[PDB]
Amino acid sequence: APSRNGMILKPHFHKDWQRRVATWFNQPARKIRRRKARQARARRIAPRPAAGPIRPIVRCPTVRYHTKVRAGRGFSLEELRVAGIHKKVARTIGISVDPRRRNKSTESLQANVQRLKEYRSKLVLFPRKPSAPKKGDSSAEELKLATQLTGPVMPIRNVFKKEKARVITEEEKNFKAFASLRMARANARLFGIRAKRAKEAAEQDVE
Amino acid sequence: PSRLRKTRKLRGHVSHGHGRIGKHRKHPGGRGNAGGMHHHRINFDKYHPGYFGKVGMRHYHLKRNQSFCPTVNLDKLWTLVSEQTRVNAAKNKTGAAPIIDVVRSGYYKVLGKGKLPKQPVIVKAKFFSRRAEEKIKGVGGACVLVA
Amino acid sequence: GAYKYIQELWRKKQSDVMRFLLRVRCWQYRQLSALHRAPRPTRPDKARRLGYKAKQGYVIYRIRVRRGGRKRPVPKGATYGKPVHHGVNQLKFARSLQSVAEERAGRHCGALRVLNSYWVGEDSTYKFFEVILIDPFHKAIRRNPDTQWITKPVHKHREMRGLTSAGRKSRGLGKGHKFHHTIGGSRRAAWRRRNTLQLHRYR
Amino acid sequence: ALRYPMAVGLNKGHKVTKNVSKPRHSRRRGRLTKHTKFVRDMIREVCGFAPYERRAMELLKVSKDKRALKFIKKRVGTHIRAKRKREELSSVLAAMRKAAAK
RNA sequence: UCAGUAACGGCGAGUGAACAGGGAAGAGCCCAGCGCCGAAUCCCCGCCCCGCGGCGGGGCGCGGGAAAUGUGGCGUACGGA
RNA sequence: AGCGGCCCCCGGCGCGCCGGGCCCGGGUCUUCCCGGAGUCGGGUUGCUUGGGAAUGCAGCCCAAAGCGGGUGGUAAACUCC
Ligand SMILES: [Mg+2]
Ligand SMILES: [Mg+2]
Ligand SMILES: [Mg+2]
Ligand SMILES: [Mg+2]
Ligand SMILES: [Mg+2]
Ligand SMILES: [Mg+2]
Ligand SMILES: [Mg+2]
Ligand SMILES: [Mg+2]
Ligand SMILES: [Mg+2]
Ligand SMILES: [Mg+2]
Numbered sequence: 127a128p129s130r131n132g133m134i135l136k137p138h139f140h141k142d143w144q145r146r147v148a149t150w151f152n153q154p155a156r157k158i159r160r161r162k163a164r165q166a167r168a169r170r171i172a173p174r175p176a177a178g179p180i181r182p183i184v185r186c187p188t189v190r191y192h193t194k195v196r197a198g199r200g201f202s203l204e205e206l207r208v209a210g211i212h213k214k215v216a217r218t219i220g221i222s223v224d225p226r227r228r229n230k231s232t233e234s235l236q237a238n239v240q241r242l243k244e245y246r247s248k249l250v251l252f253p254r255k256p257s258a259p260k261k262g263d264s265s266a267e268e269l270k271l272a273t274q275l276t277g278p279v280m281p282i283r284n285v286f287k288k289e290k291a292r293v294i295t296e297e298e299k300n301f302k303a304f305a306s307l308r309m310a311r312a313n314a315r316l317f318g319i320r321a322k323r324a325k326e327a328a329e330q331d332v333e
Numbered sequence: 334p335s336r337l338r339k340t341r342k343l344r345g346h347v348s349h350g351h352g353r354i355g356k357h358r359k360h361p362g363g364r365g366n367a368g369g370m371h372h373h374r375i376n377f378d379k380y381h382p383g384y385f386g387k388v389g390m391r392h393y394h395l396k397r398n399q400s401f402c403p404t405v406n407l408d409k410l411w412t413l414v415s416e417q418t419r420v421n422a423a424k425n426k427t428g429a430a431p432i433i434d435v436v437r438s439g440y441y442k443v444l445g446k447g448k449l450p451k452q453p454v455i456v457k458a459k460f461f462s463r464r465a466e467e468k469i470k471g472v473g474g475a476c477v478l479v480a
Numbered sequence: 481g482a483y484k485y486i487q488e489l490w491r492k493k494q495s496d497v498m499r500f501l502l503r504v505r506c507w508q509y510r511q512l513s514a515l516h517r518a519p520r521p522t523r524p525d526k527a528r529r530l531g532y533k534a535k536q537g538y539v540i541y542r543i544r545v546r547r548g549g550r551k552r553p554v555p556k557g558a559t560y561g562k563p564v565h566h567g568v569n570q571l572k573f574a575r576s577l578q579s580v581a582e583e584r585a586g587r588h589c590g591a592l593r594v595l596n597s598y599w600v601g602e603d604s605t606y607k608f609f610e611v612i613l614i615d616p617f618h619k620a621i622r623r624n625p626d627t628q629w630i631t632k633p634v635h636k637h638r639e640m641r642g643l644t645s646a647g648r649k650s651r652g653l654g655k656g657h658k659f660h661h662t663i664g665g666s667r668r669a670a671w672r673r674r675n676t677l678q679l680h681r682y683r
Numbered sequence: 684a685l686r687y688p689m690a691v692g693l694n695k696g697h698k699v700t701k702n703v704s705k706p707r708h709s710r711r712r713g714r715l716t717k718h719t720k721f722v723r724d725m726i727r728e729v730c731g732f733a734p735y736e737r738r739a740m741e742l743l744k745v746s747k748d749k750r751a752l753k754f755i756k757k758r759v760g761t762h763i764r765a766k767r768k769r770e771e772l773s774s775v776l777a778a779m780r781k782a783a784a785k
Numbered sequence: 786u787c788a789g790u791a792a793c794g795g796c797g798a799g800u801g802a803a804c805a806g807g808g809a810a811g812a813g814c815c816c817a818g819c820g821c822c823g824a825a826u827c828c829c830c831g832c833c834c835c836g837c838g839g840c841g842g843g844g845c846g847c848g849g850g851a852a853a854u855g856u857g858g859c860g861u862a863c864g865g866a
Numbered sequence: 867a868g869c870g871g872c873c874c875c876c877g878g879c880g881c882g883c884c885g886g887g888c889c890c891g892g893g894u895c896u897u898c899c900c901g902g903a904g905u906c907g908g909g910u911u912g913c914u915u916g917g918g919a920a921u922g923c924a925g926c927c928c929a930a931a932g933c934g935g936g937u938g939g940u941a942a943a944c945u946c947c
């Protein structure tokens with residue numbers, strides 16, 4: 127029974143809603159549970175990284191977001207065949223591997239291989255038996271200086287190049303931008319008819 | 334604040350502020366928006382015109398990302414780059430020009446609204462508009478596209 | 481060797497050979513009872529592609545199921561209610577006849593745990609099947625390290641809770657745009673996540 | 684004049700080079716093998732043909748292909764599966780015509 | 786969070802999703818088929834020794850049973866031998 | 867109240883041996899092999915979902931294929947990715 131001037135609106139409460147009501151009084155006693163099951167997890171593995179193995183650099187889809195770089199699932203198998211690492215050792219040294227990724231470009235393949243070459247030079251590798259190394263193990267020096275790394279390892283940061291102030295050419299004053307955007311729209315709509323009427327003239331000119 | 338309401342000031346009056354002839358019963362005029370076309374016709378024909386009917390084309394699996402295009406004017410185009418670059422640009426006698434990026438600052442299309450102060454610029458964007466292109470061509474400076 | 485093309489024989493179902501072997505086996509099966517044990521599977525091809533290793537422990541039954549829909553068990557007509565809900569004849573059942581056959585042969589022998597089922601023959605009014613049952617506590621199943629997952633008490637009655645491949649179709653799940661309405665656990669909690677009010681503390 | 688990578692048009696998009704890597708193995712499912720053709724034609728040599736095609740051969744002996752197309756499209760499915768079935772029975776019709784002509 | 790939105794509906798009353806983005810948690814795998822190794826396979830009964838309040842290991846059994854209508858090993862779509 | 871004391875019990879996990887088990891990995895090149903069948907899909911009737919020339923499920927008849935098959939939100943053919 128609406129009065130003079132109020133907005134129309136449709137509330138979704140014709141159902142029985144009082145039976146299924148999710149309260150949130152748990153919340154300040156579940157942030158403490160997760161804090162304990164995370165710090166007792168951080169003391170089980172004493173020198174390992176707390177934040178999971180390192181994770182690749184990947185762009186994002188959907189033209190709204192295609193100018194960012196964020197974390198991924200795991201490395202591909204081209205970023206490991208080139209970097210010379212076997213695909214089941216990398217699972218055992220803390221390197222995320224997913225076999226479901228393509229590489230259609232090249233300029234992210236290279237920056238991943240370079241990031242692996244950074245981590246391989248930061249990695250302190252303990253000996254199996256603390257009495258006998260391998261060819262590639264580390265010395266008894268770094269063991270005394272081995273410690274954890276809180277936070278996401280080598281955090282992924284969005285960098286931008288810069289440019290200084292150039293001098294404007296005499297040419298760019300004569301570049302009409304809008305009659306080129308609306309030419310490419312017209313040329314992108316008339317690609318079939320232009321290529322069909324020429325065929326119909328090639329069927330008509332035999333006469 | 335039970336103590337500031339109205340019903341705490343009505344304990345003593347019989348009807349409690351809803352009359353005696355036609356009492357406050359439960360639902361006189363239907364429940365909700367009943368009678369758009371029969372007997373609440375005047376309220377919708379006087380306050381919500383065009384509540385009734387269909388118009389136009391349907392579009393099924395519609396995303397809100399293919400048509401993402403935030404805008405900007407030429408008034409505050411100088412607000413992206415900090416102050417001391419517009420100064421050094423108005424100060425040097427050489428004839429250089431500071432490059433303004435919009436896509437980096439979260440804008441795509443460049444419209445044109447206001448007056449613009451006279452110093453040469455270079456704009457990298459993804460679209461333009463015809464007034465907003467002839468104001469920069471008229472001041473001096475270019476309009477550069479980018480995919 | 482043979483198992484590649486017994487496989488390709490058992491898709492000549494219109495041919496004269498399989499139209500003979502079924503125009504015989506369905507008759508032989510029709511004079512038996514509804515649920516009886518055979519000593520060896522009629523199809524070893526299809527039997528091995530589901531997990532039937534030919535050792536001690538695995539059992540194979542054979543049950544018949546009658547055919548058709550399901551008309552509503554009311555008196556004469558008399559389905560009291562609005563005229564939407566009058567329908568008695570042309571109703572159709574949700575789960576298949578294959579997981580009817582599985583749980584008819586899964587309740588009568590309660591000491592066993594169902595693995596999977598397959599097809600054998602068809603009549604006008606009968607559909608026959610085969611089933612595969614596993615002893616949970618026999619020492620050959622027990623000491624295998626791969627497949628001692630059955631004996632765990634979770635997998636009791638896989639067929640009543642709908643976990644066989646014949647009930648996984650009835651549940652309506654997978655991935656994609658085609659399966660929106662089973663996000664979460666199932667179809668129910670895809671309803672429960674939606675039709676509730678999350679009332680925060682501060683709102 | 685000058686050219687820019689236009690984000691709308693015919694060849695739109697940011698210009699990034701491209702690599703040629705090995706196509707994924709799963710990209711091949713059962714394309715075919717020589718052992719497979721060896722045995723699928725031996726079983727074809729053992730059992731014959733279905734009784735919806737022992738009428739199609741008999742309507743393709745009178746050089747009707749539109750009628751036997753509406754007759755194998757009514758049964759088997761679409762028009763694509765009807766075509767790859769018909770181009771196959773113009774072959775296992777012509778090998779008898781070839782051997783009887785031999 | 787998108788969203789009370791694209792859509793349905795005597796298009797009236799009213800019902801009503803997902804993808805992307807930021808976060809909690811983070812773990813992945815095995816068989817059949819194709820093939821090769823002389824059933825290279827299990828379970829139970831027998832005697833002895835050790836331990837046995839979750840019935841197990843090693844030695845012996847011309848002592849018996851199931852499996853060629855297929856038991857084990859390598860091997861599964863990231864290619865493999 | 868206190869990293870205060872004492873007396874019992876069961877473990878978690880660290881080290882010595884004494885036992886048995888298992889002899890296995892890379893890289894680079896030549897020759898071989900490689901996949902789930904009354905199901906996919908099509909017509910139809912009925913319930914369903916926001917899904918609209920029919921999203922899913924179920925029933926009846928018809929019933930496949932290997933440079934093949936399904937999907938690419940308006941039915942239909944010819945096409946390319
Ligand atoms: Mg009133
Ligand atoms: Mg008064
Ligand atoms: Mg009043
Ligand atoms: Mg009164
Ligand atoms: Mg009155
Ligand atoms: Mg009232
Ligand atoms: Mg009704
Ligand atoms: Mg399932
Ligand atoms: Mg809103
Ligand atoms: Mg009306």
Ligand SMILES: [Mg+2]
Pocket residue numbers: none
């Ligand atoms: Mg998402």
Ligand SMILES: [Mg+2]
Pocket residue numbers: 810
């Ligand atoms: Mg975490």
Ligand SMILES: [Mg+2]
Pocket residue numbers: none
């Ligand atoms: Mg194995």
Ligand SMILES: [Mg+2]
Pocket residue numbers: none
């Ligand atoms: Mg095998």
Ligand SMILES: [Mg+2]
Pocket residue numbers: none
């Ligand atoms: Mg409905």
Ligand SMILES: [Mg+2]
Pocket residue numbers: 576924
């Ligand atoms: Mg079904």
Ligand SMILES: [Mg+2]
Pocket residue numbers: 940
């Ligand atoms: Mg469409």
Ligand SMILES: [Mg+2]
Pocket residue numbers: none
């Ligand atoms: Mg197309």
